[PDB]
Scaffold this active site. Structure first.
Site: not given
Ligand SMILES: [Zn+2]
Lengths: 416, 315
Positions: B110-111
């Site tokens: 999710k980065n």
């Protein structure tokens, strides 16, 4: 009684049509857990129970504004955000900011400012539009002359130019990528400080309008799924640029409203995803924007007392399921206690409590009257008093400009 | 090399190889605000990163230092940028780096910073061969990962890899027909290939969506896609759609179905239909039914709708 507690409310539960998929399964779980919370308030009451734990929120905020545990190491490149999240929450909770921290915030933010314009995630970090937006918002929340004077306006303009692209979009940072949010950070920051040149946002409105997709909402880049965070940035950016009409407002309105969860009462970020406290602002914040938009276009069917969402149900979701005992607000029960959700659950709660259109004003404060939060500007998400204050101050100053760009074209050494 | 949790990890301030450089501590001012109480390891790595960045040192050591810095805060965009600047200057093996970013993304899917970096390596290498497989794997962990979907759309457009996406979309929709991310991808593929104006494709899609709605009548995604591809074309212009919809009303109703019918009637009125009154009344009725019973959370919207219909189709 309370919308969420009413008997018929059990009818609002998920009907998975007996077809279970990961989505329905995860949705049911949150609904079961939320129901448990609802039951508690239905069950017990003799003294008013929907209360905003102001006290505990203030302690959390006052502490965070000064010192953070290494749990926040992951936001070392997001320090001006922490300043905004915190100072905005305090502002909403009506807690004045002492002159000493005010000055310390200013000074810290000064350190975060790149010598070539903009603000970085911390001292000595490259500037970036997200922390730039936060830093300007934070300084505007403080609203003193010292705060305003921190922003190098000439350099900030230069910095926005360095990110401005030919197609109308803006890079998040040098060597970065673009999204509706960066366009929003530039428009927010440029309008507040009064540095909007004739060409600064050339093509921007059309670039943002292309982000609106088939759902009616706005994705981060054209082609992407409609997402509450981006949709808010998109519409807010166009309102600043006075180009909201570039979008199909009807499919936008229909999309947001559909984002409010029937059972939970709060908003999800995308269709078929879970409810989450922060969207109380990203999503609900759209309604006052759409209300202004439609109203300017003379829409006669507009309400003169309510936003186009269940204000009551959102407040119930926030107050009953989004508060932490130790202080701070949440995503949902037992999920994500941090300064971001504290800022947004509160910002959303304040949107849900206050309505205003022209001369018409009408509040809806669920729970104890003491729950009223100060109002927030739906475009900038800072106090309306702070917006007016900043702009009026920056309008005392002329918009910056590059003189070399206006003088006569040259071509021959001989004529020197 | 030396992992930050290794029992033999050595602080940078104690490494012989870094003895020549003076670390640069962060200056937060005489009385900080929002001050993070960093661990000793985090503040040590970043004191050396600031020294490396300040002197714009392009060394193999500075390159390895950025891996630790990223471990400590993979959201630091300044560190990620500098590592790319180092990848170039040191003419680093990009496939090696692809292996590194593959592993990291799997850890922090999710980065954003992490996908941006993979995107850069892909344009640099001009090789998208690993892309669709990799993203499919990530999507197995979370089929709604915004960043993974964005990257997938970028790789597909840039390298024109449209050939098998509609099939992929068919696979994921079976896995979860409520995955709105997949309904969106479907629209992305079609509007970028055959387009929707090809009446045969449009026909295929509406039929496909109707069968989908039949199976899971309360899945909002399908309803949204259906309206998505016809809204701009004029909902009332499809007489057979309306009859199939009303035919769903019994064993397949939902506030979605009712909402759709209101759209159809709304359009009918705009299009100056006959029996204006009969239609306005059918609309206003469904509006109150929605405001008061089947979609009360949206009571404010439905009261607005009904109010708008009256405001321009009455007297
Ligand atoms: Zn959230």
């Amino acid at each position: 009684p309370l919308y969420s507690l009413r008997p018929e409310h059990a009818r609002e539960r998920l009907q998975d049509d007996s077809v279970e998929t990961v989505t329905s399964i995860e949705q049911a779980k949150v609904e079961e857990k939320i129901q448990e919370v609802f039951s508690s308030y239905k069950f017990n009451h003799l003294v008013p129970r929907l209360v905003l734990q102001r006290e505990k929120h203030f302690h959390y905020l006052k502490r965070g504004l000064r010192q953070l545990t290494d749990a926040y190491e992951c936001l070392d490149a997001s320090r001006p955000w922490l300043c905004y999240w915190i100072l905005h929450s305090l502002e909403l909770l009506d807690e004045p900011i002492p002159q000493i921290v005010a000055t310390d915030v200013c000074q810290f933010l000064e350190l975060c400012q790149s010598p070539d314009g903009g603000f970085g995630g911390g001292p000595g970090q490259y500037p970036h539009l997200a922390p730039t937006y936060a830093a300007v918002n934070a300084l505007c929340i403080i609203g003193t002359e010292e705060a305003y004077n921190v922003i190098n306006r000439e350099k900030l303009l230069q910095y926005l130019y360095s990110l401005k692209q030919p197609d109308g979009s803006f890079l998040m940072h040098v060597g970065g990528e673009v999204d509706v949010r960066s366009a929003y950070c530039a428009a927010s920051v440029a309008s507040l400080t009064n540095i909007i040149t004739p060409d600064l946002f050339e093509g921007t409105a059309e670039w943002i309008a292309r982000c609106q997709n088939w759902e009616g909402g706005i994705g981060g880049v054209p082609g992407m799924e409609a997402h509450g965070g981006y949709t808010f940035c998109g519409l807010a950016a166009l309102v600043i640029l006075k180009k909201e009409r570039s979008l199909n407002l009807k499919s936008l309105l229909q999309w947001v409203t559909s984002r409010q969860m029937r059972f939970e009462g709060g908003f999800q970020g995308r269709c078929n995803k879970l409810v989450d406290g922060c969207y109380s602002f990203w999503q609900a914040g759209l309604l006052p924007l759409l209300h202004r938009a439609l109203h300017a276009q003379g829409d006669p069917a507009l309400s003169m007392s309510h936003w186009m969402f269940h204000q009551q149900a959102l407040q119930e979701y926030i107050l009953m399921c989004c508060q932490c005992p130790a202080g701070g607000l949440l995503d949902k029960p037992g999920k994500s206690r941090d300064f971001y959700h504290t800022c947004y659950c509160l910002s959303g709660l304040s949107i849900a409590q206050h309505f205003g259109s022209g001369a018409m004003l009408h509040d809806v404060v669920m729970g104890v009257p003491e729950n009223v939060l100060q109002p927030t500007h739906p475009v900038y998400n800072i106090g309306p008093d702070k917006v007016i204050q900043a702009t009026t101050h920056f309008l005392q100053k002329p918009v910056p400009g590059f003189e070399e760009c206006e003088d006569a074209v040259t071509s021959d050494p001989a004529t020197d | 090399f030396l992992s930050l949790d290794s029992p033999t990890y050595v602080l940078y301030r104690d490494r012989a190889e870094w003895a020549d450089i003076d670390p640069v501590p962060q200056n937060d001012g005489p009385s900080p605000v929002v001050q993070i109480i960093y661990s000793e390891k985090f503040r040590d790595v970043y004191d050396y990163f600031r020294a490396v960045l300040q002197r714009d040192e392009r060394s193999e050591r500075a390159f390895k230092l950025t891996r630790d810095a990223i471990e400590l805060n993979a959201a630091n965009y300044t560190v990620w940028h500098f590592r790319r600047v180092l990848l170039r200057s040191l003419q680093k093996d990009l496939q090696e780096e692809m292996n590194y970013i593959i592993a990291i993304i799997e850890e922090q899917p999710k980065n954003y910073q992490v996908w941006h970096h993979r995107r850069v390596l892909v344009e640099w290498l001009k090789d998208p061969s690993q892309e669709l497989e990799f993203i499919a794997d990530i999507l197995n962990q979370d089929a709604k990962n915004y960043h993974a979907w964005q990257h997938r759309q970028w790789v597909i457009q840039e390298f024109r890899l449209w050939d098998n996406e509609l099939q992929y979309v068919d696979q994921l929709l079976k896995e979860d027909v409520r995955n709105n991310s997949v309904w969106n991808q479907r629209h992305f593929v079609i509007s970028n290939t055959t387009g929707y104006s090809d009446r045969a494709v449009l026909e295929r899609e509406v039929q496909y969506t109707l069968e989908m709605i039949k199976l899971v009548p309360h899945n909002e995604s399908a309803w949204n896609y259906l309206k998505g591809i016809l809204q701009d074309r004029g909902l009332s212009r499809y007489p057979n759609l309306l009859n199939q919809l009303l035919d769903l009303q019994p064993s397949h109703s939902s506030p979605y179905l009712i909402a759709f019918l209101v759209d159809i009637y709304e359009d009918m009125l705009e299009n100056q239909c006959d029996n204006k009154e009969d239609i306005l009344n059918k609309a206003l009725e469904l509006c109150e039914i929605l405001a008061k019973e089947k979609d009360t959370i949206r009571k404010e919207y439905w009261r607005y709708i009904g109010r708008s219909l009256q405001s321009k189709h009455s007297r």
